[PDB]
Amino acid sequence: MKYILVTGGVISGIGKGIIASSIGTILKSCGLRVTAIKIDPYINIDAGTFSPYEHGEVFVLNDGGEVDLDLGNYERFLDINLYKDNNITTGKIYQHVINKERRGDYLGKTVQVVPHITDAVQEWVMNQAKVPVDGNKEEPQICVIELGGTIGDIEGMPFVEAFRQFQFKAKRENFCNIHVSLVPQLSATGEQKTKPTQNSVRALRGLGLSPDLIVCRSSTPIEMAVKEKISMFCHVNPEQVICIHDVSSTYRVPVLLEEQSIVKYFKERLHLPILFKWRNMADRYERLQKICSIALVDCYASVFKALEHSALAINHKLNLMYIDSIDEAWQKLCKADGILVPGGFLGKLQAISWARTKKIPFLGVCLGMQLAVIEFARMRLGIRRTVFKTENSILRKLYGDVPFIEERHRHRFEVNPNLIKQFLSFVGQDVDGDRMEIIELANHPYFVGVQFHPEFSSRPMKPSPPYLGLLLAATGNLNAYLQ
Amino acid sequence: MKYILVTGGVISGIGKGIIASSIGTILKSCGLRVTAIKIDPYINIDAGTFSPYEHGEVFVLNDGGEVDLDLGNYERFLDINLYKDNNITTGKIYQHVINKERRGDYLGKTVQVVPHITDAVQEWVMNQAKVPVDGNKEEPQICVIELGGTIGDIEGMPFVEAFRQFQFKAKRENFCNIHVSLVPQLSATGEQKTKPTQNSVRALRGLGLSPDLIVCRSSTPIEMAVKEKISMFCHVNPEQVICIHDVSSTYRVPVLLEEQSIVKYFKERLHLPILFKWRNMADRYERLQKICSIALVDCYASVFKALEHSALAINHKLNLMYIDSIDEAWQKLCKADGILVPGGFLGKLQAISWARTKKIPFLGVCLGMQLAVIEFARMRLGIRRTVFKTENSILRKLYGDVPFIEERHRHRFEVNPNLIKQFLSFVGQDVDGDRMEIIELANHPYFVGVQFHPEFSSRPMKPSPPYLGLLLAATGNLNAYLQ
Amino acid sequence: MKYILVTGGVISGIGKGIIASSIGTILKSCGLRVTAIKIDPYINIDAGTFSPYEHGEVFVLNDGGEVDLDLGNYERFLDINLYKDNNITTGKIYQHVINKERRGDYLGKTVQVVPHITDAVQEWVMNQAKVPVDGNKEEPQICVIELGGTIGDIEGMPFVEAFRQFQFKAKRENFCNIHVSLVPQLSATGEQKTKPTQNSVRALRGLGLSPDLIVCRSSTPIEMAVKEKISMFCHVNPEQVICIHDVSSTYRVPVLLEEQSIVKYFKERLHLPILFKWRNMADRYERLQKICSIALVDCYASVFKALEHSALAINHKLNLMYIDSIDEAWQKLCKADGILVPGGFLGKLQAISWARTKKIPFLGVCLGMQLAVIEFARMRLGIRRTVFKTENSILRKLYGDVPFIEERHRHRFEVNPNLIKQFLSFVGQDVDGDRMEIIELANHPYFVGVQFHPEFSSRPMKPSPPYLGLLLAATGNLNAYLQ
Amino acid sequence: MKYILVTGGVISGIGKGIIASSIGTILKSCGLRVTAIKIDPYINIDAGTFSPYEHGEVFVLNDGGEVDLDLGNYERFLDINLYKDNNITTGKIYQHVINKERRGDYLGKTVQVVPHITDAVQEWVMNQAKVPVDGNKEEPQICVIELGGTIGDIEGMPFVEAFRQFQFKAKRENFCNIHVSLVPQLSATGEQKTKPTQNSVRALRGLGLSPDLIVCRSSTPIEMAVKEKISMFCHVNPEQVICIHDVSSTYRVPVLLEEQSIVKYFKERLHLPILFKWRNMADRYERLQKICSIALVDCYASVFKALEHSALAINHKLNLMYIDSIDEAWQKLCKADGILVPGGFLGKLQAISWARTKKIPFLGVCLGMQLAVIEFARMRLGIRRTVFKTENSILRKLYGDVPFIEERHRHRFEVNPNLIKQFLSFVGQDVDGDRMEIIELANHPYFVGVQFHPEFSSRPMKPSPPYLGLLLAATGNLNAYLQ
Ligand SMILES: CCOc1cncc(-c2ccc(C(=O)NC3(c4csc(NS(=O)(=O)C5CC5)n4)CC3)nc2)n1
Ligand SMILES: CCOc1cncc(-c2ccc(C(=O)NC3(c4csc(NS(=O)(=O)C5CC5)n4)CC3)nc2)n1
Ligand SMILES: NC(=O)CC[C@H](N)C(=O)O
Ligand SMILES: NC(=O)CC[C@H](N)C(=O)O
Ligand SMILES: NC(=O)CC[C@H](N)C(=O)O
Ligand SMILES: NC(=O)CC[C@H](N)C(=O)O
Ligand SMILES: [Mg+2]
Numbered sequence A, B, C, D: 001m002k003y004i005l006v007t008g009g010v011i012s013g014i015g016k017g018i019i020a021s022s023i024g025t026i027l028k029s030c031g032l033r034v035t036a037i038k039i040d041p042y043i044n045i046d047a048g049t050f051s052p053y054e055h056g057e058v059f060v061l062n063d064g065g066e067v068d069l070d071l072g073n074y075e076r077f078l079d080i081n082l083y084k085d086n087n088i089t090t091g092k093i094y095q096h097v098i099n100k101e102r103r104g105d106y107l108g109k110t111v112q113v114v115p116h117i118t119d120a121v122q123e124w125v126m127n128q129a130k131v132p133v134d135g136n137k138e139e140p141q142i143c144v145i146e147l148g149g150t151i152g153d154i155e156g157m158p159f160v161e162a163f164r165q166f167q168f169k170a171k172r173e174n175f176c177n178i179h180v181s182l183v184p185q186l187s188a189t190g191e192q193k194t195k196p197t198q199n200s201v202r203a204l205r206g207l208g209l210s211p212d213l214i215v216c217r218s219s220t221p222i223e224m225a226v227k228e229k230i231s232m233f234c235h236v237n238p239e240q241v242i243c244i245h246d247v248s249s250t251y252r253v254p255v256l257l258e259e260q261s262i263v264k265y266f267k268e269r270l271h272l273p274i275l276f277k278w279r280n281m282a283d284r285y286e287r288l289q290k291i292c293s294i295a296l297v298d299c300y301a302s303v304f305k306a307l308e309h310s311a312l313a314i315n316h317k318l319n320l321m322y323i324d325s326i327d328e329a330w331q332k333l334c335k336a337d338g339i340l341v342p343g344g345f346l347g348k349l350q351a352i353s354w355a356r357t358k359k360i361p362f363l364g365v366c367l368g369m370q371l372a373v374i375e376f377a378r379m380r381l382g383i384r385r386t387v388f389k390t391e392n393s394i395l396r397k398l399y400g401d402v403p404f405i406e407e408r409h410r411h412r413f414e415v416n417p418n419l420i421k422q423f424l425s426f427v428g429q430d431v432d433g434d435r436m437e438i439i440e441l442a443n444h445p446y447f448v449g450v451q452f453h454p455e456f457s458s459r460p461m462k463p464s465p466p467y468l469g470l471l472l473a474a475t476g477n478l479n480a481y482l483q
């Protein structure tokens, strides 16, 4: 397989996942099947224990893997459905090697980082790259590997040592390395400074990799004097120093990479047999004039992404108003064209009662369904089939008249079957008939609650129907859309 | 507690365990209760899976812990009985942190090397230092920590980062660091070279520790010009550059440290409220003239140590003749004053039949008992009580007429109770009466087989009685000793 | 002496010279005599060969030393007059050691970086610290050492190794180290990132120094979560993590350091026997409402500084309009309340003829005098005495009626004595009577040309009289000031 | 040109100069013209100020360059005559860059290590490689560059950064790097340890070079297990891990490199168009049985080398007896078959009077001529012509009847012309006729004194005639040789 490593310098928040997902959809537009793997140097096995404040939201995969949001970036850009072992962590690898040792698999030899941990990294990366992650059983051609962290962090040292070796245990034709680095710009002078990138490239080069591309992220476009310094002190040609500045949307980030000629570079380097939508969506986004104000009652990234897909599909700008549910909160809730009550693991019941009584559009997700059932009366993890109990339901029209949907669940509580006879219609259930998994309130333009998280299914080309329904309702257009 | 870290430079085989055990028995001679901990940066949990070729023999603790031989050095020097958690490994610590993560104990925070692994190291080192490892319930005063590896190995980086912090999270009065480094000597010139030590001290200093002592190990004593270079370039006073050269025995290594004044240094530095035997045993060893040639039919370190304790106790030099049992082997076996058949997990039966028929003294250990029972006819891990079935047995006289002994076992097979009635006397058994655990053959000066490993119980001050019995028999003196 | 090292991390432009000059005037306000030294790791001996585009302007000292502008920051803040050896460069030190070697002074020993270059650094820093740099012959108490560059640059490695040693070859009471580091703030999130500071502190700690203060420079004030990360990962208490954000003026930067409590820290640490103006000037600067627009026809730093001193002294804001003299340039020159033609080594004659014919206030400096003499008709380095040829001159009134002034020259051409009889009055000359060094044109509110650079004499408390005269004339107030 | 860099690891004394000179004479035997350059990271310009105790003897070049002894190794192996700029030092390069700065040659730009010092290294290495250093005006094909020091020393960092760049600013076909590293062997076990080499290769790889060959120097030949560890952890094939053990003579070191196949490696790598004497001389040296005991009254390396060339040419082993001239010294001087009084800058007169009165063979060099003239009565640097005053002189027969010789001088005193008329024959003089430069005493088998140092002219294939004459006289064979 062809491998593209993406390493970070200076600071992690520079958008490496957006770079990695961008070069993935570029190569996908060039007809190549692209896998992705994320390395997270954290010792946590899965993100199921994380707070959404730490590493952003917990993204859920079809197999029930709970991971950080950058796997959702890979899904949303590439239109792939990842498996849990496309997340590599230090915890997963050290536990593997430890469990191999206790089986005797290392044949009485001393286990140590080089070779055994570095070989575990290589074995994992070789094998999960070969796994069909598009719906085609046809084995992938490229695997993009985001090495999370910044090079120089001690946690990341096993992985760069593995990738150093993986150059030599492959071929140059089959392995390239992107370094994404910050070029800070001083407020006093406008002077863009190269010294972080120079020092970070020196560290990466000290660890036996080298930049095949340097990707400057910067506030303003980098001047030629700054690119000359980088190409000199980082020992890479001008064509190999790429600038991504602040732009309107993530839709524009692939387009900058075309304009900086990465496909010529990867064609030459990786010996490859080689957008429209990305320009169209970027150009749309810059030309949005109508506003939809949704009350949301990186902690809710896929939620926001799904709304913005939906918003762009109806040529509205989203004015997303985040509201802490313990609560100007009610002022925001007055100019709410829709209420979105997302998931979590009580004060949300304010907004649900408001939405119900004032007939303001409502989407409840997970907890929002449970609370809506409770309000009206006053782990199941990964992909499951939810069957519709009628065809007279708004979500069934939105999903295209299909008798069931398959969506990603993450919940440990459910509605009691014995109490549903006290009743708001329960419109979707599990195949067992026990759990109700979708509610719709009929005396309302759009008040639906779903047990599942349809966010994780959202992609720009196909907005999440429960989130689309909300934005259609919030602009009156639902009555048109179903007609 | 007071802590003494011992770090290695250049190469691991320089005797750091002998330095650490030496400064331990020095401080014990000064009346201080000394704990020891060994850090092994290997990812192996326990040494139970190791080949005796890799890391030397597998030493067995009373609690059933299977560890590398350097814990046996701590036991043999200090006369302490260690617990399995006095061995720290990367595997034990990473598995701890991983299992804490899966319990939720890190409260939805991202686990990473600093802090979480470094804190696990500190927590472990604080708590196992406080554990009474002498028979006194009186909590220890000093803990010697051998950091295995060489500083600069990637495996060791979590530990030095932990110890960097442990300086600051303690007091200077409570933490010192020994650096043991090679001073290589060129064959062409006799020139002793300081550059390895300078470079290794620079690495240690780059990792936020510093030498409080530099211990040069060297072939010849270091000249003053060499010590001046080290004290300049390593930024430490002349009194803090100690030389241990090649000497006769490990018995002399504490004595060099007295003569290089470490007790004055530790009194001043560690604010401490402060040998004979070590000189006596060293002086004896240099004056040994009689030879005992034992056929042994670092893989057998505690075995060799136990023989040399026994040999010194009868003022003989041991000419230990190692013989691969698949086999000049029979030439060695002809000048064998005793056969020692140690443990392992078939060709040994040559030497046992030889020993039986020619009346040459025999000690069989573990496998050697099983094979001796088999020859005459032609896991249970850690401390167990073995009871004697008579008082007319040579081992019972050797052990001082006691009705039982408590010795360290490591075996998964045993003699069949149903077949013992076919019978060589079975002299010791388990308390259950099922397993026979000691045999003696009566028509022989000394042919005993034991299931246990009495090596691990050997200390210079009290030689292992089965090994002593062998050397007494091999010199005729057994008939005198029992009389 | 007490020493304060100031090291940089991430990027050089963060204002380390302003930090170093700030802590200097703080300690001066506490009654201490403060020396300053700047280390520039460049191999250039002097700045006399530099372009003003590279390292900013060439600042000129009284002794004829041509240095970078940060020595001018030390003069302007502290009111000291530095000597050329208060600039240390790699070139000056390597040439010293080389010339010592060629004299035989190293006694046939091999010269190498440690010790000989590192000792040369220490010898220089010890001795130039002791030099009275205030007008008091009373030896200094503190020496602030700005280590230019960023720690991690190869050029700077001799100096940090010297300062590592200088800790130990002094006392902790006599040596502290400030680390100034960038905390970058992401545009997408507002998230302030600590990873550069953590990595730069790790480098500094790897080189055997440590931060006694960490000074974050940042766009916004740092949040407490960001300071907690820094105090944890950089192993320094919260009180030792100082935040300097973007503020109105350099006048406010000492005031932030008071408010972050550096005097308590230095009192405790350095065992010291311990502003108004800085607050007053900061508060004035923020309250400026009147504008003076001067046409200037970091390349002209002391010029801009001298104007802003003058502007603040008449409570006007300076709208400094820089104009490339080869040239909207004439649009700027129309709204010029004064023309300033600075020095350099032809198109400037446009602005001088304009200024002369339209009676718009003019200051010509060096080249501007020479060009003004030429227009009307159509090295001498460091402090020299210029004598006035009358008392009926505007500059003599401005300088306080004194018959001569002593100002800093830097010119290789001068007016021909034989041609002055063709004449615009020549008002000041050298003591030799040969060179005319000041001109005034009488038929004009203010058209003066001076050979010297009176910028380098400017300090906030005493604005440069030729620059003050310009701003008084540009606001009509000159007629009042002389009256 | 093709370039071969030779870097050191662990310790400098491992024989890198002998490796570099060996691969030079290998490639010379393959018909290639080989230049050599030595980098000495010392700041000393020339070795003229060195003590012979520090860096060994001061070797003198034809151009009057005074250098360390490793340039003499290049001359003695390759039969080249080096120029002073074939020695590169930090002092020579920093002074070059400094002097360029003061000429304005860097065009007002800031001088710093990268690029300017690194470019100076490259410029020097490119240009002195092209200089004909054989007597052929035909430009060289290979330049061997010994990088002195050990990689990891701060002094050497400019040079490895230069060579990192010089890979890329050349081609792989034109640049290879040898790493010479110590494999220490423990006395206790015979275990050969790879960890120094692994750590030193990691440092070299961190500095952006990599071993193309790893040359282990070792006491015993390295076992295959040790070479497997090195080829794994240093990431180089088995064929690229070469072992040079302790051997009889330097003559055998090329032969080991043939037997380890370096010519196949350099043919493949460097794309080259490709001994006897070295085997013959090695085999002779091992078979020497007759002894010649010379009293010498690395400080005298070329002297010892010249004696051993001479000794091998008459199939005697040299028993060189070094005697401190202030002085068992006279016991050595009794069994002296010849006295050698070398140069230096008084007690030597004991041995000269002894040699004269007892008719024991004498060679006086420089000071030894001056002292011999003084005893009988009781800078001029580099190549000069010395003319013979007769053909009835022993040195003229030894040098092959030639009327003059050209030999390397290094003296500041000479014999007074006015006093020679008081006279021992003065046999050779300068062309000016002023200085007497050779004496011979007639009433003696061999008592000659020379002003020059004929050591520096010695090569195995052509022994230095004054040193040959001594050893012939000391074995009676002079009377045969002249006949
Ligand atoms: C190297 C990165 O450099 C830069 C430079 N400048 C700006 C940004 C930037 C970063 C994040 C965002 C963002 O999150 N925007 C939103 C959105 C809608 S759709 C989607 N992404 S998506 O569904 O995964 C699929 C389409 C790809 N994002 C509205 C929420 N917008 C801009 N990134
Ligand atoms: C750690 C630095 O952090 C920050 C944070 N925020 C802002 C700044 C900042 C940097 C430079 C400037 C500046 O140059 N301002 C001017 C001026 C007038 S007088 C003088 N300096 S001076 O004469 O040497 C003597 C008084 C000290 N400067 C107008 C030209 N103003 C603000 N620096
Ligand atoms: N995913 C969620 O929103 C969780 C909802 C609720 N706490 C449950 O466990 O069902
Ligand atoms: N410790 C040993 O010598 C092992 C003996 C034998 N293999 C057993 O398991 O009993
Ligand atoms: N300092 C300057 O402005 C230089 C002016 C002019 N070039 C001279 O040398 O006199
Ligand atoms: N080269 C030497 O032996 C020096 C001899 C003597 N000191 C001189 O200067 O002539
Ligand atoms: Mg973070």
Ligand SMILES: [Mg+2]
Pocket (backbone or CB within 6 Å): none
């Ligand atoms: Mg080993």
Ligand SMILES: [Mg+2]
Pocket (backbone or CB within 6 Å): none
């Ligand atoms: Mg710069």
Ligand SMILES: [Mg+2]
Pocket (backbone or CB within 6 Å): none
């Ligand atoms: Mg040396």
